[model samples]
Every structure is written in C-alpha cells, then in structure tokens.
Target: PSAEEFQQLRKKYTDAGQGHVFAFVDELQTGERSQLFHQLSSFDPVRINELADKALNPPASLEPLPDIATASILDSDPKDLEQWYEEGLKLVAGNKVAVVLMAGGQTRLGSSAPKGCFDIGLPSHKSLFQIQAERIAKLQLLAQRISGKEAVIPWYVMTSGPTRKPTEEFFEQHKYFGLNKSDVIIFEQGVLPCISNEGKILMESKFKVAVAPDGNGGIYQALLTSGVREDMRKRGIEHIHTYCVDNCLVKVADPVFIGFAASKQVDIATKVVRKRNATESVGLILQKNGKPDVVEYSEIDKETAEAKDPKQPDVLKFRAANIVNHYYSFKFFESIELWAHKLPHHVARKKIPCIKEGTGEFFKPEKPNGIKLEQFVFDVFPMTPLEKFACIEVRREDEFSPLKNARGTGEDDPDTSKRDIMSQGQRWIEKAGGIVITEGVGVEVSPLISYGGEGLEFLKGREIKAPAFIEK
Candidate 1:
C-alpha cells in the first residue's frame, strides 16, 4: 500500500512540476516516506494551484466589506452593564469558562526562546507565560469568590511544533506557575506542507518536506483533534476566551466580556479596539457581502478605508481594528469542527529554503520561491451566522499591547509592551487614590492582587513608591 501511495504522489507532483519533492525519497526511511506521502496526498493540488494563480493576479477591485457597527463599552446602559456583570459572575462561579492562549510561534519577536518565554523586563522580570498564568490563577480566585464555590479556569495553550516542548518545559519548570498541572493543557498547532509557486510541494531535506504552521485558524481543528473539545464538554465548559500570547495586557477569561456574550447569547464574539488611524495594519471587523467578517488591512482600498460617517463629523472610523481577543461558546466551536474544511485559505508568497532536485544539495532562494497557504482565525466569522456574532470595543491601553518586535525597535517592541503594563498598573493605583511616586519608572502588579482595577480600591489614600513591584 505504501509503495502504491508513493508512486501516485510521485506522479502527482511530477505532472504538477513539483517533481523535485522526490529528490530525497530514496534517502528516506519507510516511516519518513509514509509521512511525506501522507502530507502530499493531504493537500488539494487543484485548490492550491488556483489560489496561487489568484494571488499572482489579484482582482482589480475588491468588494470590500462594509464597516460594522459595534457595541461600545462606555456608551452602554448602566442597567445592561450591571446585568452582564452579574451574569458573567454567575458563569464564572459555575466553572463553565476556559481560556485558550495562542502561543504557537517560536522566537518571532527575535527572542532566543519561545515568544511566551521572553521576559518583558518587568520589575519582577516575569515572562509572558508567567504573567498570563498568574492572571488565570487570579481569575479562578475571583470565580470562586463570586460563586462561593471552587472554580478553575482550564488553560489551553496552543503551541506550534517548535514551541510545544519548550512551552511545556517552561510550565513544568515553574511548577505549572502555581496552576494545577491538569488544569493547564498544552497542545501543538497543526502544520501544512509548503508548496512552490507552481503548487508543487517543497522538500526541506532528503527525508522531510518543508512545512509551516496552518495559522491561528488551525486552532479549531487542533482543538478537535487534541481532545480539547471533548475535555471541555466533560468539564462542563461552555465559554472560551481566546487571545494571542504576545499581549501582556490581555485579561484572560475576562468575566465582563464573557458576561456580555452570555447576555447576548452570542456564539462568537470579538473585542476590537478603535483604530489609531485608518491604515493601521490590524484587520477590521466588518460586513462582507452582507455578512459579518474580518477584512485584512491589505484587502481594503485607501479611500473606502479612510472614509468616515458623514453624519458623525471628524469621528473617522472605517472598520474597528481587531485585537485578536475573542470569546467563543462551545456550540460555535462544535460547528467549526463540522465545517472546518470550508474555511478560506489565503496565499502568502515568500522566499523558501529547499533542497535542489538531483544534486542532493540545499539552496536558499533570494526571491519569492513559494506560496504558503494559511487560514485566518477571523475567517470563521463569515462562516458563522451574523446574528450569532458580536463585536465590542475595548480600551487599547487596558487590553491591546502586542509585543512583536525587539526592544526599542518598532511600535510593538518589548519596550512598548513593558511600558503599557506599567501604565496600566499606574492607572489601577491612581484609580484607587494611590499615588505612583516615580512618573516614568516601571511598576509591576500581580493579577493576584487586583484583576482589572478591581480590589485596588483598598489602596485608597495609600502612597506607592515607584520602581515598585507589588504582588499582594
């Protein structure tokens, strides 16, 4: 059977101009050959070839999605706010919530280790994972307090092949960072083989084909395949809070957001931040062809993107910028499992390293050599019924600091992420009538002390000296 499969794959690639993939087949072990063949057979060559053609010659005009109207945190009615808050508390107390952290990239921020393992240079020098773990612990405490019952926020970290072991090791090294070992689940994201611009698979080595992660959208399938969905069902988990690992300020399993979704009975909900400008690189929550969807920044034309509502002067807004923070009900994810294959695949042209055929030699191309197919997590929006979706605005400072660059380099550098954390800490202190002694000095506060400015009221009239790291 394996021999027959290998012959079919060889024919498929050869006919498609990617015959170079078999250059190392003779050097591969039986198991390796089987795996490679499986990967090659898994991809839909016709679909990928069509996508590559479309990418090379994009449409002259994109039917850009219309801007979506979003619910506002500040503008909401007090009664509605109180209702959701209470409902959110009830859900938390019921232990029906979990958090999924997307921590699949390795050293994308120029760190030597996994991005989540990089220290943001806080007063306590806490790595991203440490801070997030602490937040989950704190939220669990809050749930227990509110419900007068034991509550645990099961944490699921979605890691990539390269990041999976290091992330798990880090968690183990820290003794699960004060979390129960069983309560924290680390699963690897799925990978897909890379294809040449001609839609032929690329060989990374004589024994393996080059592959990359299937993007954040891969989490849905990963969850299903990893038994996370089944685990959630067994644990009675109904709501999930998902966020990227890069954001130091993310409120994991945030009760208020969960409460809002629960109140609206939404299956899928996302928190968005108002764009700083029309051209911000973040994707936008909008309506595509009369359905809810997130449009990539590159997909929209400048004029329509920058256009403002004529009725609301100088209040320019295109589509609300995505923060990559979302809430998902279990039922919504179940639907994803059923229709996973229907999600759209986007093509990304890039320079790829590969072994040259016949020569048994490796070479790095200086120009675009291949197309990487990826699916965006937000692409699921369109698949969901519009009425089942919800988008709400969140304060940028409170929720959206992404650390995607080296220190002192760009907008989302380590310096900025660290500063954002300090600033949020300062706000919490000041809101409680506590004074931050040093204006520019960094202040670090553990989530155990206060989750999102709550309980900080006890600090009223207290004076906090700066360069301070307070956990209690």
Candidate 2:
C-alpha cells in the first residue's frame, strides 16, 4: 500500500462510516488494495448480510412441483420423431438457431488456463474448443443441405472476468478453430463480491477483493449487457441452444432438441439424463410451488429423492437429472426486464485467506470464512410459466460426458471423458456397419466427417482398426 493512497482510502471509508473496513489496510497496503477496499466498501452491507442469512438459514418452504407424465426420445413414436426432425431442419435452414457456451471458470478443472483450451486427448488431440467449433461448422453444413438455404449458426460464448482475455486469445490463436470469427460472439460473465461470515467483504490481498463469477445464470444478464441479445434480433435468430463447456459430447445446435422444443411451442426446454442411481450428484427437474425448477442433489432428502411410483416398480423413476443443457426462445429472453425479473443469488461457504488487521500478517483460515454468491441458470425456470417450459430425457452415453475432475482421480475426469468419447466413436462406426478389428483400443471421429453420428454411410462394409482417427 502506498502511504498517500492508503491514507486517502482510510479517510474516504472513515468519512463514509465504513472506517472499520480499513483495519486491515495497513497490512494490505497497495494501490490496487486501496481500490478494491473502496469498491467493496461501497456495497450495502445490509443487503449482503441479508443474502448471507438466507443462504445459511434457508426456509423450509421448498415444495416439490407436482409430477407430470413425460416423454423421451427413446420412447417417442417414430412418426412423431420424424415430424420434429423435419421441423428442426427447417429452423436450422433458416438460421434461427444460435449456441451459447457457458465457459466462465478454470478452477473446476484444476487448470490455470481456460477450460476451453484443455485437451481431452481425442485420437487427434484436439482441444475442447476445436471439437465444439468443428461441430458447429458441421451443423451449419447439415442445415444448408436439408433446407437448401445458406445456414450459419451464430456461436456465443460467455466467459468470466478472469477467463475472458485468455479464452479470446486462445480462439484468436487458433483462428477460431475453423469457425468464422465474425459469427463467434464472446461475452464476460458478471461478478459479485464475496462476503465474510461476518457480512464484511473479503479481500484476497490489500489491493484485490475476493469475487466470483455470478454463476451460469448470469448469462442472461451478460447477454443483455454484451449487446448479443440485440445482435440476435438483428440477425433474425429465434432460438438459442445453451450448454456447458465441460460436456464434450454436447450436440451443438442439435436439430432434434430444437424441433421438439419448437413443436411444443415452449419458451424454454432442457435436456436431462436419468441419474445412474439415487445417490448421484446431479440436479433434479421438479416442480416447486407448481412451477418448474431444479433442486440440487444436496438440497433434497434421500427418501424423497429415491422414491418411485408403485405402478412403475421396474422403472427407478424420478431420475430426471439436469445436465445444464437448455434451449431458450429469444422472445422468452426479451420478455424479462432485468430489474423486475432478477435471478436469486445462492451462497457457498468457503475457506478464505485474509490479512490480520493492523498486523500486516496473512493467514489462510481452516474453516469457512467467506460466502461466495452465485446464481444458477436453471433458476430461471421458476420464472417461466409452466406451459412454456419443457424437459426431455436423453441417453447419457450419447451426450453427457462431463470433464470435471483431475486426470485419473475419479468419475467425470479427463480419462473417463476420453473413454466415453472413444466409446461413442466406436458406437457410431459400428452403427454405420463398420467392423472394429482391434479390441481395447481408442477411436475418434471428427465432427467434420459426421456430427452426432450422421453421414457415415460410406463407412459401411469397411473395417476400422482401433487407435484410429477418421476425418472427412
């Protein structure tokens, strides 16, 4: 902390009656430190404390939504499937579909770089962004082929303040992984300050206050602020397919999902996978207070969560797990007035390092010292009318490989993700009538050759050896 700047910060906070926050400024003295302290001191402590109280002592008013009969792609009638597929083709051909990738942090993957740049070790060693970009390009080509119209799907990526620069630089370095740079729109997620358990703002250093991305739900606000929403209007875009970056198998601009959502005339739709078991750690799609919403696994009790219908004993139902995959109508987004329809913030208790006031000493606490605020995108479901919301079940193996762990630590790790990708590749090749000659070997198929297992008719009657990478 510079002596002059530190004194100025102390005086400003003192004048504003937030002088107590400066107790640590002596130890945390720096130009940036004073700025952060000033910025955090400006927030309403009463409001931050109120949010913290709600998170710590949540009310027991969470009533589950009434269960409704549902349908899945696996069980839908072939004729109905054909109809939706046709409709999806039309929408794609008209360029009504866009994609939003919620990639805002690097901590989850234990990486210092943006998660988009992590390599999942496909046979060709393509990074996640490369695979996703190629998939978008393929989707565009498919739409044009089906609808006989020039089709281009606009890609929008949401990054956080910490991730914005690196992510943009990575994309630029790779020339957008073969995507038209103009068609790709990148925006930064909003940030919220972290509050101490005592309701005071926490500081990472004297100069930097602790803050986190406002969760994936912040994408709605980010879209508005980044001007992407208006840009979508000008481009005649109607629907958006939003998914997390961790899911390597996500079908970017998926036609079937778009068609199904369009057919039902719903404003918002989500893709879900059945939980592997009652103990699975995933959000569940349920109605709360007669409105659709998601309940994180930790929030629900085991008996209620694992309950099954008496008539459907064979079906371990109530397994509709949210995969963070969603489709939203642009109109539905425009309907929300930011201030009037604000999303609720949730708090997480975390151990935080802080400087001891007046001691010029720092120590990391072993216990929870701060509350981090975040908002889940699914929280928006409750704001939509029941008639305007929909959820569809999808096969996990086909589209739910999430990279969320270290290399070989546990499930959802890079190894598991890579294995799942190879397994899907094998399935695609075998489904196309190709023979797998080698056992226990990895195989990878590029999105350019066939997206979501399409256009592989030539692979029929061919023998594809293991440890193979195929591209068109």
Candidate 3:
C-alpha cells in the first residue's frame, strides 16, 4: 500500500513546482530512497505554493507612507508610576500574566551558541538566560509580597529549529536556571521550507528541505500549535509581557510596565526608548499614512528624520524607538491567528546553504541564491486597531540595550551590553545609598538580591570596589 507514496508525492511536488527535489530520488540506494520519500511526503504542498508565490511575485514596494507625524506615547512619570506598579502586581499574583522570550537562534549574540546561553562579561559571569531566570524569580517574589497572593509566572521561551536543541539542552543542563521545570515552557516556532529566489524549493540534503522559522512576529501561532495558548487560558493568564532575549537589561515581566498596560486597557502596548536623535540608527514608532506604524531608521529620508518635535523642542519628531519590548492582553494574544492573514510576509534575500543542483555536492553559496520569508515581531503593530494600541516611553540606559553584534562593532556588542548592565547596576546601587570607591567600574547586581534597586538599601554608607558582584 505504501508503494504508492512516490506517485502521490510526485503529483504533490510537481504541482507545487518543487519536482526538482525528487529528481534523483530513484537513484538513491535503498535506505536513502526511503529517507527522501519520507521527507518529500511530509511537506504541505499548499503552504509551499503560497509561500513561493509570495517570493516570486513580490508585493509592490510599500508606498511611501503619507505625511508622517510623531506617534504619541505614555511617557514615564512618577505620578502614575506607583499606581501602575500595584495594579500590575495584582495580575502577577493572580496568575493572570506570562512572559515570553523570543530567542531566535540568538544568531547575533555569538557564533553557533544560543544567544541567552552566551556569557556577556557580567561580574557574575552569568549567561543572559540565567540573569533573566533570576529576575523572574525575584519578580514573582515581589508580586507575591505586594499582593499577598500565591501565584506563578510561567516563562515561555520561544526558539527556532536551529536554536531549539541547544537552547533546550542548555536549560536542562542548568536545571531551568533554578526555576521550576514545569513553569518554564520551551516551545518552538514553526518552520517553513526555503525556496529559490525564483520560487523552487531547495534541499539542503537528500532527505532535508531547507528550513527556517516563521518570523517571531506571530509568536502566538507557535503557542497555539504547542497547546501553550490553551494552557495559558486554563491558568487564567489575562496578560503577557513578551521580549527578545538579546537585551541584557530587560526587566523580566516588569511590574510597572505591566501595570501601565493594565491601566490603559489597550489590546496591545509597546515600550520604547527615546531615540537620541534622528541620526541614531533606530526605528521610529510613529504615524504613517495617517495611521500608526513604525519605519526602520534606515528607511527614512535625511530631511524627514531630522525634523524635531515642534512641541517638545530638541526631541526628534518621531522619537519612539522600537525596542521589541511589548505587552499584550491574553485575549489579544488569542486573536493572533485571526489577524495572521493581514500580517506581512517580509521577503529577504539571504545566503542559503544547499546541495548543488544536479551534482548533489553540498556547498554554501557565496551570494544570496534564495529568498526567505519572515515576519518581524513588530509588524503585528499595524494589524491592531490604532485606537486600541498603547505606546510607553522608557529610558534607554536602563531598559534598551540589545546585544546584536560581535565584540568589534561600535554598537550593541558584548562590550556595550556589559557596560550598560554594569552602569545600570551601579546607578541603582548609588541611588539606594551605596558608593563604589573605584570609579568607572561595573557593579553586577544579582537579581536574587535586588530585582531592581530596592533591596540595596543595606549597602548604604558602604564603599565597594570595581567589577564587584553583589550576590546577596
């Protein structure tokens, strides 16, 4: 009965314009044929055809957005800050919140290793994931103390096919970085086959189709397929705080940030830091075509970018920089699949590795020979009701450092991230009445000791050395 696999797949692959993959299938020696046949049978032809159409018949370049205006955001203010924090803590204590870390191959943080698993020069020498896990434990404790309710904040780490194995193994090796095994859900985002620029599917090996993950933009879809979405509902999670793992200074499920979103009651909320100026190389969250949208810093014109916010002198006209720190209502999160159709599929030309066509010799191409379709996490912003969205302004130094480069690059490299974390830690300690005798030094504060700056009051009237790890 299974002998019919070849004919059926032949029709499926041929109709989808991927018939080339099976060209040498019959030439395969026994077991190899079974492997190729098995792999060929697993692809969903319709999905392949749809994606190929997108790659081959590119969408018209997005028309230049209409006269843009600075998008307004809820600025950080002390007055409402206290209220927002308490309100946010209540949800945390009630098990109505969750946190998601989008750690896609952590491709830029280091070579081959998962981003969170890499150690960035911290005084503690702790990995990014380790720091975040400790921060979550502290937040859970803080939320419990403030609300007097016993609850758990489930952390969802979203990984891709390449990052999934090492990421999971790393967590297992560290024993979930000290968090409960069940509370930390390591779910994989969906993978799509890679196709040539002309829309033909490429195979990396006899039995493997080139694969990449659906962009992190629709992370909820991953949650859905893994049943995490359903599980979240059962746990009464009403809100979620999602972020990328590259940020060394991310405040895990920040209570104040959560509280602010809870107060606004918007379906979606984004936290951004003010771009230093128009020329600072950061995307701006502003209005386009008379509606809310964010355009990359690279996509702007010199004249438009340098325009100042007339009302707030010196500030760029569009100062809300996209940092990928976001908050979403559980109900809004559940609606991710419904808006899936409207989300854009960004076609990127990337250097892809594949078997040499016909020759079957494996070789990595020197130039981009294929197109990859991915969605940015921020692209989901446009699909939401403009009126139902919220944007909050945050200070960059404390919340916005992302490790996106190797050691030598000028920005967002390990050196920069280490400096930011150390600087922030020092600032927090100083504000809490401590002093570092050695100037220009970094102070790495353990999240276990201080989630933020509060618990460091004990350091009052004390002087510490440079590069100190304040574990207790």
Predicted candidate 2 versus true structure: per-residue lDDT over 39-77, tens digit per residue: 755565556556666766678334434434245888889
Candidate 3 lDDT at 269 equals 80
TM-scores for all candidates: the values are 0.91, 0.91, 0.91
Q: What TM-score would candidate 3 get against the native? A: 0.91
* Cα lDDT of model 3 by residue, 1-472, tens digit: 1667678888888887777887777667778777777766667777888868866885612222232211222444566788887888888898888999998754444578888887887868899999999999988888889777766999999998788999999999999978999999988988777888777788888667887888886586787888888888888899999998989889889888888878877777887787876677677777565455777765578877777756777766666788888888988877867776676777778888998777888889998999877766777777766666777777788888988888888698889999998888889889988998775567888999998787898999898887888995
RMSD of 2: 3.1
What lDDT would each prediction earn against the true structure?
Answer: 0.81, 0.81, 0.80
Backbone clashes in model 3: 1
- Which 10-residue window in model 1 sums to the lowest lDDT? 60-69
- For candidate 2, the TM-score is 0.91
How many residue pairs clash (N, CA or C atoms closer than 3 angstroms) in each of the candidate models, in the order given?
0, 6, 1
Kindly report which residue stretches of model 1 are placed more than 4 angstroms away from their true locations once superposed: 1-17, 27-69, 311-315, 439-442
Candidate 1, RMSD to the unseen true structure: 2.8
Backbone steric clashes in candidate 2, count: 6
User: Native-vs-model 3 lDDT?
Assistant: 0.80
